Amino acid sequence: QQLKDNGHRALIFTQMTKVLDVLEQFLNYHGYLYMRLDGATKIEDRQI
DNA sequence: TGCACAGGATGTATATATCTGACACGTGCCTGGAGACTAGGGAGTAATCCCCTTGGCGGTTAAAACGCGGGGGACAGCGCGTACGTGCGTTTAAGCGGTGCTA
């Protein structure tokens, strides 16, 4: 929230995929404009 | 005249008996149990060294799964033609028991 007020663009790095999914649910619940890239993202999708 | 029955004739289901198979009881011999000797294979013991999961984990991939189109494979109907089913008359040789040999 503070960072958005400042207009910053923040990265979150985590070791666990399941928490990545939890983060998806969290960000959707707040509706932050977010994107995901992980060990399963398609290569072309990774580039784009 | 034709019927009733007195006197007599083949037959036969009923009844009494003779003509064939199988099981139990008697001999008697190659035995089965038993006694003792036997040892070396089995079983008890002890490493020992090697192969089998740890355990879930992400980042990947190859195979599995799921969805769809469609077109042709399966298949229920059925026209019809015949070649197996049922039923003769007729023949063969398969079955029966018998006699004599033998390998």
Strand content: under 5%
> What about the largest sheet?
none
In N-to-C order, the SSE pattern is HHH
- Distance from N terminus to C terminus (CA atoms, Å) equals 27 Å
Proportion in helices: 40-55%
Number of helices: 3
According to DSSP, the number of beta strands is: 0
Rg estimate, integer Å: 12 Å
Derived structural class: mainly alpha
Overall body shape: globular
PDB class: gene regulation
Keywords: Chromatin Remodeler, Snf2 family ATPase, histone exchange, H2A.Z, gene regulation
Entry title: Cryo-EM structure of native SWR1 bound to nucleosome (composite structure)
Name: Helicase SWR1
Topology (elements, then pairings):
Elements: H1 2-6, H2 17-30, H3 43-47
The protein binds one DNA strand of 103 nucleotides through loops.
Overview of the structural elements:
The termini are far apart. This protein is mainly α and about 50 residues long. It binds one DNA strand of 103 nucleotides through loops.
Keywords:
part of a larger assembly; 1 chains; 48 residues; mainly alpha; 0% strand; globular; DNA-binding
Short description:
This protein is an all-alpha fold. Helix content is 50%, strand content 0%.
